[PDB]
Amino acid sequence: VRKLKHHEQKLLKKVDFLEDYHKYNRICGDIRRLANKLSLLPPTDPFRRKHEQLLLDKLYAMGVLTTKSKISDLENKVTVSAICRRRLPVIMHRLKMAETIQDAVKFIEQGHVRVGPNLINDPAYLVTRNMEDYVTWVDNSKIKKTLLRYRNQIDDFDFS
């Protein structure tokens, strides 16, 4: 509706009903309820300790955690910013593979970027810590020709 006048505002308030990180906010929140409740379960229990280790190892195995972590840290290390930096286009940028995130999204959609043996056309794909070493352009990318053409190392035999 139009901007409400002062007397209109005072009589009626909160009548203004009728980049999103909602999912990552839910991902962060879900991690919280684990460690909160995993604390509730008794410490000497063997089932809690293994389950805590599987979580710490796995968010580590993601790279949400740059280093190995204790549960006490996990209630604060995890952030929406941690999930986004694992996004392939954000990985694309830090590597200097693409100048801008939007440019990285375009290349991902056009199919010029391979991660290990598999090609990804989904920009929202996030990369894990064992896997970022192998992100690169597809062998027959026209982009990969301009790479080696300037440096004058374009080898036709590799078709790149």
Binding site: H22, G111, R114, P117, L119, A124, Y134, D139
Partner: protein
């Protein structure tokens, strides 16, 4: 040089739809995703039909004659197939989502539940020549105001009961003249009506609602009209009725609920015959046998198909398919059984002959990446993404040992020594091959040398050398056994994804990212062959691709390859819609297969991942019987076999060779010539005919005189024929004469006869040994009783 055709789907039994019993009651028809599978309960056998729908199957039905099978997908597109000959008859599009299809008991007509419309059509005549426009609609009926849940036929093909979500059960007359007889709509239910049925006399109509209420309808004077004389209520605490069926002859009511349980009742007394719980997942479908003694049940969530004999409280069929896609498969050395592994982390053991899950293992926490057998075959090994490698004894079916690394290394590939004493696994994160000892369970040593992740591993069967492949653009040959250890690296053009080892152990082929199958000599470590795969591979544009398939580079490589046991062929598979069978010595494509034809599979043709299923093959191995190969894919285990042998491939045929002449030689008692001439024609019926008609006395004479060229072929024929044949003593006598007469020749050339010998030992080990085991036990069970003194 053999024609492989799709035979059956393993690792998978049921997805959705309505299960239908064969009219004889000895077979069960289950729709399996994009295809339909038939299970022979009496004979304990199974097959999957070759024809494929455009989309997943929605409803099926088999006529009482057993000749016409109709299947309809979710788009309304119907496929009529001759059940006996397993050939498609006609393709029709009803242009509407058909909820249910059911043949008339007379068989002339079949009814379709279409939204709030009931369509009645005329069944084509199978005896007639293939007609172009055989479907003629008898009538179309619509009084409902909402979707029809189901329909039921009268036993006399004159009235139909239809239940809809309008909280009404309603009846029609198939004959226009008989409309005044049955033009009633039955009401009273509080929720959706699930099933309306006739009594055997058809005097009574039973209607069942989703709430769990069964109403008994009878014509009575208050002048005469239908009224609810009796009311029954299912007092389920929260479970809702999901599927209902009724058998008029025996008055059995089988109701499947959403809570995952069912109840059997005897109407009109409402006596609870039995109640069992099917699980926590809804019981989607239910069917009754023609006799009424077997009950088939189905839940869609976990792919569940069960058959129950309520008479004896026994289970005829009880089998689960993998919840996820199968990531790897492994045959037993003899080929009698195959083991499958899924992304869930559960391993399953399957019997090739029966095609049913013998056992399941739940010990692995995460996805099981690889599965392999030892040479001996008693033991099985598997690697998983939980960080463990587990060894399994398949006689007692126990995990007798578990292996793991110091720091919980993630394993993706596994290899086992022929002696069954060393197990080696590879990882994507460690770049190292962990080596263990089977007997003791400790880490013998770590084989270092790769600068990239180890993609595949394999032990040479004979020489016992290990060949390892990695994304480091090279392949390494390890002579771990011996006083001194040597490693021979052979660099490769691009990233290697799969590796296959020659049964001779002299050669190794590898599939690389460039789409090349390069074959290297293990001893000389030099290239001997290379095949192009880029063009042959078929990849379909995914719906979200903003770049064309031809320009796409997503998957033109093969992530899995295996050799044929003869050694002249490679079957290759990858994240694509194609399986390609190549010939190693001469480097061509023998034949290519389309793995799937469902559009719902992506490859057939900002905080949310757009993420849908894709068509793919994870692993592909040859059967050791040398007659089939299995491909692990998302839908399940596709086994392609050469069993039909309709093709004509004569060997060394001449004008004088003729089936009549072969019979004439038999009549003249020239058994040796008849057998040779039959094998030259390569006709199984003629090869069979000569085989029994020779007397037992003449077997050693003929066997000693067989030419060497025909020796491998006769041994193969005996092994495959003897596995299912009843003439155990007759077939064995051939194996005696052939081994006794030509045994030395077999030893000189072991590999030429390797498959034929193996088929023989399977026959004598898996059936012949079992027979004598009972025979001796009875002989010994006999002796103790007679000699021992009776009790006072």
């Amino acid at each position: 040089k053999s024609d492989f055709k799709f035979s059956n789907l393993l690792g998978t039994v049921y997805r959705q739809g309505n299960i239908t019993f064969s009219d004889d009651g000895k077979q069960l028809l289950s729709p399996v995703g994009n295809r339909v599978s038939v299970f022979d309960l009496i004979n304990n056998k199974s097959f999957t039909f070759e024809y494929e729908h455009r989309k997943n199957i929605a409803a099926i039905d088999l006529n009482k004659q057993g000749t016409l099978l109709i299947s309809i997908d979710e788009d309304g597109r119907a496929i009529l197939v001759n059940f006996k000959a397993r050939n498609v008859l006609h393709h029709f599009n009803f242009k509407e989502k058909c909820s249910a299809v059911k043949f008339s008991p007379d068989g002339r007509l079949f009814a379709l539940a279409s939204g709030r419309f009931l369509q009645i059509w005329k069944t084509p005549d199978v005896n007639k020549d293939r007609q172009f426009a055989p479907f003629v609609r008898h009538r179309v009926h619509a009084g409902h105001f909402q979707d029809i849940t189901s329909l039921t036929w009268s036993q006399d093909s004159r009235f139909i009961l239809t239940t809809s979500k309008d909280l009404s059960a309603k009846i029609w007359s198939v004959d226009s003249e008989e409309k005044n007889l049955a033009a009633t709509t039955f009401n009273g239910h509080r929720d959706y009506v699930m099933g309306a049925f006739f009594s055997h006399d058809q005097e009574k109509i039973y209607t069942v609602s989703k709430d769990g209420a069964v109403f008994v309808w009878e014509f009575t004077k208050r002048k005469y009209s239908w009224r609810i004389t009796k009311k029954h209520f299912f007092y389920a605490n929260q479970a809702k009725v999901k599927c209902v069926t009724f058998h008029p002859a025996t008055r059995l009511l089988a109701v499947g609920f959403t809570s995952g349980e069912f109840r059997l009742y005897d109407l009109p007394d409402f006596t609870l015959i039995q109640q069992l719980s099917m699980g926590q997942n809804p019981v989607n479908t239910v069917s009754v046998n023609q006799t009424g003694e077997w009950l088939a049940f189905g839940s869609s969530k976990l792919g569940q198909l069960l058959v129950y004999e309520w008479q004896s409280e026994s289970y005829i069929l009880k089998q689960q398919g993998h919840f996820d896609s199968t990531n790897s498969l492994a045959y037993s050395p003899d080929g009698s059984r195959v083991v499958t592994a899924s992304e869930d982390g559960k391993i399953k053991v399957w019997d090739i002959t029966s095609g049913f899950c013998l056992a399941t293992f739940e010990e692995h926490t995460s996805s099981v990446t690889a599965v392999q057998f030892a040479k001996r075959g008693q033991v099985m090994f598997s690697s998983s993404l939980d960080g463990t490698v587990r060894a399994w004894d398949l006689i007692r079916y126990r995990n007798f040992r578990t292996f793991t690394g110091t720091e919980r290394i993630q394993f993706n590939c596994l290899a086992v020594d022929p002696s069954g004493e060393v197990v080696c696994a590879g990882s994507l994160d460690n770049f190292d091959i962990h080596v263990w000892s089977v007997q003791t369970g400790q880490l013998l040593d770590a084989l270092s040398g790769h600068e990239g992740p180890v993609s595949c591993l394999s032990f040479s069967q004979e020489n016992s050398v290990l060949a390892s492949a990695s994304w480091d653009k090279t392949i390494r040959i390890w002579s771990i056994f011996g006083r001194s250890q040597q490693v021979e690296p052979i660099e490769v053009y691009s990233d290697v994804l799969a590796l296959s080892m020659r049964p001779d152990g002299k050669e190794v082929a590898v599939s690389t990212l460039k789409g090349q199958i390069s074959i290297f000599n293990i001893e000389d470590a030099k290239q001997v062959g290379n095949i192009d795969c880029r063009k042959d591979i078929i990849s379909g544009r995914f719906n979200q691709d903003r770049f064309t398939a031809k320009n796409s580079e997503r998957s033109k490589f093969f992530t899995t390859i295996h050799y044929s046991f003869d050694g002249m062929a490679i079957v290759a598979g990858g994240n694509n819609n194609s399986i390609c069978l190549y010939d190693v010595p001469n480097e061509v494509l023998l034949k290519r297969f389309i793995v799937s034809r469902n559009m719902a599979l992506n490859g057939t043709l900002l905080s949310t991942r757009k993420m849908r299923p894709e068509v793919r093959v994870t692993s592909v191995q040859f059967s050791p019987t040398a007659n089939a190969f299995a491909a692990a894919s998302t839908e399940g285990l596709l086994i392609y076999s050469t069993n039909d042998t309709i093709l004509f491939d004569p060997f060394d045929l001449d004008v004088d060779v003729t089936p009549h002449s072969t019979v004439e030689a038999l009549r003249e008692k020239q058994f040796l010539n008849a057998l040779v001439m039959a094998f030259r024609l390569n006709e199984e019926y003629l090869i069979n005919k000569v085989y029994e008609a020779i007397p037992i006395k003449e077997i050693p004479l003929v066997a000693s005189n067989i030419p060497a060229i025909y020796l491998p072929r006769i041994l193969k024929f005996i092994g495959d024929f003897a596995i299912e044949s009843q003439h155990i003593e007759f077939n064995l006598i051939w194996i005696k004469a052939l081994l006794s007469a030509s045994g030395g020749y077999i030893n000189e050339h072991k590999y030429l006869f390797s498959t034929a010998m193996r088929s023989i030992q399977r026959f004598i080990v898996r059936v012949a040994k079992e027979v004598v085991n009972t025979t001796t036990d009875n002989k010994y069970t006999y002796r103790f009783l007679v000699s021992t003194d009776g009790s006072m």
